[PDB]
Design a protein around this ligand. Structure first.
Ligand SMILES: CCCCCCCCCCCCCCCCCC(=O)OC[C@H](COP(=O)([O-])OCC(O)COP(=O)([O-])OC[C@@H](COC(=O)CCCCCCCCCCCCCCCCC)OC(=O)CCCCCCCCCCCCCCCCC)OC(=O)CCCCCCCCCCCCCCCCC
Ligand SMILES: CCCCCCCCCCCCCCCCCC(=O)OC[C@H](COP(=O)([O-])OCC(O)COP(=O)([O-])OC[C@@H](COC(=O)CCCCCCCCCCCCCCCCC)OC(=O)CCCCCCCCCCCCCCCCC)OC(=O)CCCCCCCCCCCCCCCCC
Ligand SMILES: CCCCCCCCCCCCCCCC(=O)OC[C@H](COP(=O)(O)O)OC(=O)CCCCCCCCCCCCCCC
Ligand SMILES: CCCCCCCCCCCCCCCC(=O)OC[C@H](COP(=O)(O)O)OC(=O)CCCCCCCCCCCCCCC
Ligand SMILES: CCCCCCCCCCCCCCCC(=O)OC[C@H](COP(=O)(O)O)OC(=O)CCCCCCCCCCCCCCC
Ligand SMILES: CCCCCCCCCCCCCCCC(=O)OC[C@H](COP(=O)(O)O)OC(=O)CCCCCCCCCCCCCCC
Ligand SMILES: CCCCCCCCCCCCCCCC(=O)OC[C@H](COP(=O)(O)O)OC(=O)CCCCCCCCCCCCCCC
Ligand SMILES: CCCCCCCCCCCCO[C@@H]1O[C@H](CO)[C@@H](O[C@H]2O[C@H](CO)[C@@H](O)[C@H](O)[C@H]2O)[C@H](O)[C@H]1O
Ligand SMILES: CCCCCCCCCCCCO[C@@H]1O[C@H](CO)[C@@H](O[C@H]2O[C@H](CO)[C@@H](O)[C@H](O)[C@H]2O)[C@H](O)[C@H]1O
Ligand SMILES: CCCCCCCCCCCCO[C@@H]1O[C@H](CO)[C@@H](O[C@H]2O[C@H](CO)[C@@H](O)[C@H](O)[C@H]2O)[C@H](O)[C@H]1O
Ligand SMILES: COCCOCCOCCOc1ccc(C(C)(C)CC(C)(C)C)cc1
Ligand SMILES: COCCOCCOCCOc1ccc(C(C)(C)CC(C)(C)C)cc1
Ligand SMILES: COCCOCCOCCOc1ccc(C(C)(C)CC(C)(C)C)cc1
Ligand SMILES: COCCOCCOCCOc1ccc(C(C)(C)CC(C)(C)C)cc1
Lengths: 68, 56, 55, 65, 103, 56, 97, 220, 114, 62, 45, 53, 57
């Protein structure tokens, strides 16, 4: 279906690929290495519960007053 | 006809010259083959009355 | 001149959406991305083996 | 005496290699800014005509109108 | 070391027909629209074909609403703006009596 | 097990509401607000906007 | 004694984040939000149900009168229109031409 | 006013959708380069190979990119662009059509303008009268009193020079129309079968269930 | 004319099918599963299904994703939205006058054009 | 090319000059428009000035 | 609908161009360019 | 001198490293200007002991 | 069908698409050409002129 050149990636000679840099002494920085810096929110979860309650309540209050 | 086959772009010159001179009339002729048989109205010849206007 | 009529400004709400079928959702090709993202990630990050010690 | 086939750089020698690298990775940087902009351009869009629309958005390009 | 790659885009373009190809493509497409698509579709005299269900199916996401006629009122607003910018008399056209090419 | 831990976790949540609020106030006044704090606050504001719509 | 504008280690560390992308890292990561919130699933469903809704409304009630009503009754009539269109009682319950 | 000739163009989402087609070319990085290398070296040997090669590569990769954007990145134009005939004729076919005329246009033009001087081609033309006929009369054939119809002859001869460049245009149009029909008809047929299945299952909610599977049908 | 070129192995086709089978084998390697927690409803005959024993592979790959496994499900509630609205519409009571005056997508309506 | 270029350009220039001179002495609508333009007037003003005469004398305005 | 998927309704507006006015202004620019430069008739301009 | 930096753990750009091979940097830049990214048969003709390798 | 239309045959919108696409292509050609081959490295390393000297005796 396809010639061997397309599969192996070269017609005659296999060219050397420059390897990937590492940046010794620190973590890799890639699109997939970002969870090292940004975990899921874990610090303000209970504050999230409180603020969700208060937001619901205040919205309901002002909406009911407006409607009435 | 003997300049057409000469070198130095004379083939292009001959072709373009034949086009510009007679090939346009040939295009018109080909367009007119399907016009000769068709019912066409009388030609509304210009009365040559409209356009005259005194200067001022 | 340039215009910006109010006919284009209309109400919007996700509640009024008809939606999709199970078949149309399968045709949306999300289930394909779901698998092949992991497939290609696995192929790329598993091609490059690190050094080791055989136990 | 100096070594032959060597000289100082000149303006017509072009930029250095690190500068060419900085030129190369500009599309890769603008990718991160443009793909979200593409998604925002699609998501924050509104159709321009409806069955009820008496008008359609017009854009006079040269202000002739 | 001098290269048109890094020092002259013009000489690079001149030295590579595969750089001329997209430009010729663009010019040809625009010429095609100018010759064929311009007057038949985009002109005001030829813009109602977009209301056709056979040649322009669902150009407005639906069948064209003729009771509403968005084209008519859009273009009428624009012509009115032209008239106000030009200060032309609406009723001056009705005072005309064209002759006939008699005989 | 989940029911028992859900019950037992309510005192922790009600106790740490005030703690998290005070730490957020201190970080906002002091300005010592970092990336993870910003992400948590954005998640917070998203859920708060949802619950605002819900309360409406 | 490098004569060129030597680039710091951290600047290269940051540029590597941008130039070390692979094709799948773009394709799937941008296709998931796109396929979900695109012309297929969400944005398409919304924006194409709106057309049928307002066609039904302007045919049955009118756009001006609809504009005069409340947001609640607006939504009620919109939902009724969405149901009428999804049903497609005249097309034999088939969304085809 | 009289002098005001007004034209209406319909403008939509073009800029941001065309930018990313080009930005993706850095990611693909011409993965099709080896295939077109192989094929071009199969089909021609000249100094101007690389030129035509580059052209095809660009054209081809754009097609590939659009196809994947048509399959995966479904927004706005990327869905219609493969279902539109203008893209398949002018957006894919015209470039491939004009590529050899842009690379080998000198030779083809010289050939075409020489073929207007229509003549019979002789192999091992060691004849002497052939030369006199070609120079004096212009052609091997008898051109006596053909000037009498020169008006048509010119234009006809022009076609006689390009008739062997015309099947390329025909094949380009044919395969553009083929791709358009394939995409459109297969999408329509698949969607139609899906809608019929949904009609069968919506009226029978015992079957309105993920009966093949959430990922199985989608993966297939 | 008579160049006498030797055969180029790169122009042969002896690697494409092996490479595709290598990719498919890498895919199927992730279908290996432990005996614990295994259950698959077979057909009524007792024979296995087609899609059944090839769900573990797909979901083992979903496990490895990063963004699609948390996003591509958000279009699924829309399916249930349709399931509910369709049943709402199957028996919706409507005014006869509006249906006769403004039928939706009915043929021969001159206000549409035909 | 230089003599040919000068010949072509100058012959066409003098042809256009002759054309304008012939139009100016022509007792017609186009002659009037050409005259009004040679005075130093604007295109729009001259069109209006000539059409005001066309509507009256030629078309016979209501 | 399937046909609904074969539709491009991502339009934004209608660009209105008075080609007569644009041609008039182009000709005016040409005249202004030729007068300001004081260019002769034998010039390529 | 560049390898001294590489041994210290410093990352060198692909083009920064080429500048430390100036004679190859020039021929590589000209090959880019010409626009022929192919390679392999030139090595097999100049060094026929590599033919087929 | 919708795509079966003469309006979509010479659609100026797709022509704008093609125009912007290939103008951007032209703008970015000098970055597509910026891939390095390692052939002149090979030539520098492996090209070895004959270093033997002449000795008549
Ligand atoms: C339920 C649907 C998901 C169930 C299982 C999935 C799941 O819960 O995963 C966790 C999932 C996401 O994980 P997360 O990081 O903990 O999310 C933060 C919570 O949403 C932050 O909100 P919260 O859940 O921590 O507390 C908000 C609180 C607020 O209480 C109120 O005042 C609301 C009053 C409603 C009447 O509501 C309640 O906790 C219980 C009252 C009923 C709601 O949270 C939920 O979806 C459950 C809460 C959602 C409630 C509204 C859903 C619409
Ligand atoms: C022997 C005569 C054989 C020439 C055959 C011919 O067609 O000539 C007329 C032909 C255009 O005539 P036309 O378009 O039928 O008449 C309307 C004018 O173009 C009206 O346009 P204009 O007079 O205002 O512009 C004049 C000048 C002004 O140029 C400049 O301003 C310089 C910048 O040059 C041009 O613009 C070139 C002509 C117009 C554009 C190309 C032809 C348009 C064809 C239909 C539309 C195609 C769309 C193209 C889209 C391109 C992408 C945006 O002129 C040329 O295109 C090339 C002239 C080269 C003269 C070299 C003479 C040196 C001899 C030694
Ligand atoms: C908007 C920013 C995306 C937040 C993604 C959170 C993250 O760090 O990213 C982590 C998540 C994966 O989370 P898991 O490791 O838990 O599977 O996604 C990624 O790994 C890369 C996301 C790339 C898209 C960036 C936008
Ligand atoms: C009854 C209603 C339906 C059922 C109940 C509600 C749905 C509950 C399911 C969860 C919520 C679904 C939200 C639906 C919103 C919607 O309708 O979606 C459609 C809308 C557009 O619809 P309209 O244009 O018609 O208004 O789009 C949005 O909501 C914007 C969402 C932004 C998503 C960004 C995700 C980024 C992920 C990170 C990827 C990083 C990679 C790089 C890319 C930049
Ligand atoms: C055109 C003028 C050519 C004058 C001439 O000698 O004409 C000579 C040519 C014949 O030349 P040949 O014998 O070389 O073919 O006449 C014709 O071909 C027909 C021209 C029409 C004459 C009116 C009938
Ligand atoms: C000059 C553009 C003037 C303008 O505002 O126009 C801006 C419009 C966008 O206006 P809308 O977003 O309202 O549709 O886009 C264009 O007109 C650009 C057309 C590009 C094709 C020509 C090249
Ligand atoms: C180079 C500088 C050009 C310049 O300064 O041009 C400047 C002139 C002056 O315009 P204004 O005086 O009205 O500002 O622009 C024009 O007159 C119109 C230019 C054409 C713009 C539209 C492009 C699409 C073509 C359709 C119009 C009809 C064709 C006109 C011939 C091109
Ligand atoms: C080797 C296989 C040989 C057998 C060939 C069988 C024919 C296969 C044709 C594949 C091409 C069909 O092309 C595909 O069509 C479907 C169905 O409209 C489109 O699907 C899209 O439109 C449909 C129409 O309702 C929506 O419901 C769906 O949500 C959306 O994804 C895809 O976006 C397109 O990619
Ligand atoms: C089967 C019926 C007949 C039809 C046959 C043709 C089907 C073609 C469609 C499948 C195409 C697969 O296309 C595949 O693309 C990848 C790109 O990642 C190519 O990959 C190639 O290029 C990359 C870089 O770009 C090289 O690093 C790699 O070594 C090489 O394999 C594959 O060689 C090719 O096989
Ligand atoms: C970015 C994509 C679009 C790029 C478009 C650029 C196109 C450039 C080519 C312009 C072609 C010039 O072609 C010129 O067009 C104008 C209209 O404009 C024609 O002009 C004709 O129509 C206009 C109005 O419609 C009349 O006012 C005028 O008296 C008449 O001659 C000219 O007879 C023709 O010579
Ligand atoms: C504590 O604060 C938390 C966030 O509060 C932000 C409040 O934002 C105000 C939002 O205002 C509205 C109000 C109504 C709506 C509608 C009715 C349009 C939403 C809808 C259609 C989803 C019901 C949208 C936004
Ligand atoms: C029958 O085949 C079905 C599989 O097709 C899935 C289509 O995927 C779209 C593109 O997916 C990719 C993603 C990345 C790649 C690689 C990893 C080769 C990219 C590369 C060359 C940058 C490393 C190849 C294909
Ligand atoms: C019946 O169909 C047979 C057609 O065969 C097609 C063969 O193409 C296989 C393409 O799939 C790939 C993809 C990537 C790769 C590799 C692993 C070489 C990619 C790389 C360069 C990123 C490591 C190899 C093969
Ligand atoms: C890019 O190319 C990769 C595309 O490959 C896709 C292959 O899809 C088929 C995989 O589906 C299966 C089929 C069978 C099986 C298992 C059921 C092999 C059979 C078993 C586990 C009973 C031995 C698992 C997954």
């Amino acid at each position: 279906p396809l010639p061997n050149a397309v599969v192996q990636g070269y017609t005659s000679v296999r060219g050397p690929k420059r390897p990937l840099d590492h940046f010794y002494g620190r973590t890799p920085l890639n699109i997939d290495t970002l969870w090292h810096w940004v975990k899921f929110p874990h610090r303000y979860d209970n504050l999230r519960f409180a603020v969700c309650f208060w937001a619901f309540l205040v919205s309901a209050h002002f909406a009911n007053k407006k409607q009435r | 006809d003997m300049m057409k086959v000469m070198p130095g772009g004379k083939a292009f010159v001959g072709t373009a010259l034949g086009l510009a001179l007679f090939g346009g009339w040939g295009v018109e002729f080909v367009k007119n083959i399907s016009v000769m048989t068709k019912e066409k109205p009388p030609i509304d010849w210009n009365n040559e009355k409209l356009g005259h206007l005194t200067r001022s | 001149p340039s215009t910006s009529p109010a006919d284009k400004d209309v109400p919007m709400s996700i509640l009024h959406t008809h939606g999709l079928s199970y078949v149309n959702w399968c045709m949306s090709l999300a289930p394909g991305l779901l698998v092949f993202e992991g497939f290609f990630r696995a192929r790329y990050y598993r091609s490059r083996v690190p050094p080791s010690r055989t136990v | 005496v100096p070594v032959a086939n060597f000289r100082p750089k000149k303006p017509w020698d072009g930029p250095w290699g690190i500068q060419i690298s900085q030129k190369k990775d500009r599309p890769f940087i603008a990718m991160w800014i443009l793909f979200p902009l593409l998604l925002v351009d699609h998501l924050t869009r509104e159709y321009y005509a409806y069955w009820h629309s008496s008008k359609v958005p017009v854009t006079d390009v040269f202000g002739d109108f | 070391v001098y290269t048109n790659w890094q020092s002259s885009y013009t000489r690079l373009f001149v030295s590579k027909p595969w750089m001329w190809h997209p430009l010729a493509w663009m010019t040809l497409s625009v010429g095609i629209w100018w010759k064929f698509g311009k007057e038949s579709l985009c002109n005001e005299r030829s813009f109602y074909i977009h209301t056709h269900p056979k040649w322009a199916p669902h150009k407005f996401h639906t069948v064209y609403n003729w009771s509403r006629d968005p084209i008519k009122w859009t273009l009428a607003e624009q012509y009115a703006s032209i008239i106000r910018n030009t200060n032309t008399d609406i009723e001056a056209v009705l005072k005309i009596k064209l002759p006939a090419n008699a005989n | 097990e989940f029911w028992q831990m859900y019950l037992a976790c309510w005192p922790y949540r009600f106790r740490n509401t005030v703690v998290e609020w005070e730490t957020c106030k201190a970080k906002v006044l002091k300005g010592s607000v970092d990336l993870q704090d910003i992400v948590d606050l954005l998640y917070l504001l998203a859920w708060a906007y949802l619950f605002w719509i819900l309360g409406e | 004694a490098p004569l060129y504008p030597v680039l710091s280690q951290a600047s290269l560390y940051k540029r590597h984040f941008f130039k070390n992308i692979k094709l799948f890292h773009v394709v799937f990561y941008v296709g998931a939000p796109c396929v979900t919130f695109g012309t297929a699933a969400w944005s398409g469903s919304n924006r194409n149900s709106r057309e049928a809704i307002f066609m039904v409304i302007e045919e049955r009630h009118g756009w001006d009168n609809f504009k005069k009503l409340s947001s609640h009754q607006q939504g009620v009539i919109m939902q009724e229109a969405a149901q009428e269109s999804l049903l497609a009682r005249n097309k034999g319950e088939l969304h085809l031409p | 006013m009289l002098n005001s000739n007004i034209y209406i163009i319909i403008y939509g989402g073009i800029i941001m959708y065309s930018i990313m087609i080009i930005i993706q070319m850095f990611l693909y990085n011409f993965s099709n380069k080896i295939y077109i290398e192989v094929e071009i070296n199969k089909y021609i040997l000249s100094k101007n190979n690389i030129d035509i090669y580059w052209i095809i590569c660009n054209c081809t990769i754009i097609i590939i990119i659009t196809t994947l954007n048509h399959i995966i990145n479904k927004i706005g134009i990327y869905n219609m662009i493969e279902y539109n005939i203008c893209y398949w004729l002018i957006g894919t076919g015209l470039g491939l059509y004009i590529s050899p005329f842009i690379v080998f246009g000198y030779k083809f033009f010289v050939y075409i303008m020489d073929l207007n001087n229509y003549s019979l081609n002789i192999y091992h033309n060691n004849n002497k009268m052939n030369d006199i006929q070609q120079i004096y009369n212009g052609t091997n054939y008898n051109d006596t009193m053909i000037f009498f119809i020169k008006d048509i002859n010119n234009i006809f001869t022009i076609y006689r020079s390009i008739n062997f460049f015309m099947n390329w245009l025909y094949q380009m149009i044919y395969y553009g129309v083929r791709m358009w029909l394939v995409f459109v008809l297969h999408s329509f047929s698949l969607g139609s079968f899906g809608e019929l299945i949904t009609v069968i299952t919506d009226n029978n909610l015992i079957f309105n269930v993920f009966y093949i599977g959430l990922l199985g049908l989608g993966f297939i | 004319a008579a160049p006498a070129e030797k055969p180029d192995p790169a122009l042969d086709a002896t690697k494409a099918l092996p490479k595709a089978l290598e990719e498919v084998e890498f895919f199927q390697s992730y279908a290996v599963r432990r005996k614990t927690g295994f259950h698959l409803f077979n057909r009524a005959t007792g024979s296995p299904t087609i899609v059944g024993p090839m769900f573990y592979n797909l979901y083992n790959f979903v496990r490895i994703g990063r963004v699609s496994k948390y996003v591509c499900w958000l279009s699924l509630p829309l399916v249930f939205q349709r399931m509910w609205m369709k049943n709402r519409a199957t028996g919706m009571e409507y005014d006869i006058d509006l249906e006769n005056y403004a039928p939706f997508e009915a043929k021969k309506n001159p206000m549409h054009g035909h | 090319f230089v003599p040919a270029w000068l010949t072509f350009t100058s012959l066409n220039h003098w042809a256009q000059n002759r054309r304008l001179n012939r139009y100016l002495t022509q007792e017609s609508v186009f002659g009037e428009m050409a005259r009004e333009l040679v005075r130093g007037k604007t295109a729009d003003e001259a069109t209006t000035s000539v059409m005001a005469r066309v509507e009256k004398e030629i078309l016979g305005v209501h | 609908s399937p046909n609904e998927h074969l539709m491009f309704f991502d339009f934004s507006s209608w660009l209105l161009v008075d080609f007569g006015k644009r041609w008039e202004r182009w000709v005016s620019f040409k005249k202004s360019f030729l007068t300001t430069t004081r260019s002769p008739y034998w010039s390529p301009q | 001198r560049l390898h001294e930096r590489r041994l210290r753990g410093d990352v060198i750009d692909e083009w920064e490293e080429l500048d430390y091979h100036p004679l190859v940097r020039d021929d590589t830049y000209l090959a880019i200007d010409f626009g022929d990214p192919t390679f392999g048969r030139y090595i097999w003709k100049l060094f026929p002991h590599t033919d087929g390798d | 069908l919708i795509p079966v239309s003469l309006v979509d045959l010479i659609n100026i919108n797709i022509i704008f698409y093609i125009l912007l696409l290939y103008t951007l292509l032209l703008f970015f050609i000098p970055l597509f050409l910026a891939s390095i081959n390692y052939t002149y490295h090979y030539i520098y390393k492996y090209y070895n002129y004959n270093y033997n000297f002449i000795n008549n005796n």
